[PDB]
């Protein structure tokens, strides 16, 4: 038993990170096969940021203008394309290393795993959510450009993520690897705002059957509610509303503990109008909503890769 905020094991995406330079400018690149994708804002000098012309400063720039190591190795760039806001780097050679792999956007309240890197070697991991308004809190420096994100169905590496920026309040933006923003953000280093940010109720639920699965069980009471008067609450506290696919999402942990999803709605309801108290659920004096339903799931389930 227990209950840990758990990263995918690295080991897969480790073997594809190389250091990507341009001018003076170093970050990280994914190398898959023969091709490397970074920010395309590795062209940039510092003074080029704050308004940055990508297709005028990209024809100055020639193959041989790039320098791909991957540790000890040099690469060799044979050709150069703009996707969006992702530079890919043809190279001589495709990576060993290559797992099985695919290119997924992810939505809203998705989890994924982190590997941060500077000069192109793995620094640590870390698990976080997609906020509703499409930023990260994470945890980056400079030279962190072009670390991923990632998830594993068995054996298979799902990229969902390249780190671009911090934004002036802190929080983290990025890409796909095709190279579309999550949010509204564009790589120029101007004042851009990120939306309202809201809980995501269906994780906190998910959360709450972990704690059940766990013995931690005070919060749970005698009420109930209806999605309605449930969503009303919800709205006032910032929380995201709760549609029919999240009940339909959560029917296998209602099945598990033999609580229904509205009777934990009700629970949760009581705790935003009346809060902790002082208490603490899987140690912790907040609702954490970092957790899918799927994540809980795997962790009570045992499910490897
Ligand atoms: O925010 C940036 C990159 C931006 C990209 C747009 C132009 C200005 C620089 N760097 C960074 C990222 C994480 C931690 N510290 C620094």
Redesign the pocket.
């Known amino acids: 038993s227990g209950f840990r905020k758990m990263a995918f094991p690295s080991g897969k995406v480790e073997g594809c990170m190389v250091q990507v330079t341009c001018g003076t400018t170093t970050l990280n690149g994914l190398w898959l096969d023969d091709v490397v994708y970074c ?1 395309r ?1 590795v062209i ?1 000098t510092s003074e080029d ?1 704050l308004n940055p012309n990508y297709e005028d400063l990209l024809i100055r720039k020639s193959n041989h203008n790039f320098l791909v190591q991957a540790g000890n190795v040099q690469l060799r760039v044979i050709g150069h394309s703009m996707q969006n806001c992702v530079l890919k780097l043809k190279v001589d050679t495709a990576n060993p290393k290559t797992p099985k792999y695919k290119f997924v956007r992810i939505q809203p309240g998705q989890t994924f795993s982190v590997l941060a890197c500077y000069n192109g070697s793995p620094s640590g991991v870390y698990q976080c959510a997609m906020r509703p308004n499409f930023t990260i809190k994470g945890s ?3 030279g ?2 072009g670390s991923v994100g990632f998830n594993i169905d068995y054996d298979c590496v799902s990229f969902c993520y390249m ?4 934004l002036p309040t802190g929080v ?1 933006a990025g890409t796909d690897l095709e190279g579309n923003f999550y949010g509204p953000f564009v ?3 101007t004042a851009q705002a990120a939306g309202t940010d809201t809980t995501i109720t269906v994780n906190v639920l998910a959360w709450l059957y972990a704690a059940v699965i766990n013995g931690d069980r005070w919060f749970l009471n005698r009420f109930t509610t209806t999605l309605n008067d449930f969503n009303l609450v919800a709205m006032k506290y910032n929380y995201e509303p709760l549609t029919q696919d999240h009940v339909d999402i959560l029917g296998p942990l209602s099945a598990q503990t033999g609580i229904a999803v509205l009777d934990m709605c009700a629970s949760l309801k009581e705790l935003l109008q009346n809060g902790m108290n002082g208490r603490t659920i899987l140690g912790s004096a907040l609702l954490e909503d970092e957790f899918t339903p799927f994540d809980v799931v795997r962790q009570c389930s045992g499910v490897t890769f």
Not at 163 to 166: D, F, K, P, R, S
């Open positions: 920010p804002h940039c940021m980056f420096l400079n962190s450009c780190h671009h920026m911090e983290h790589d120029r280093q």
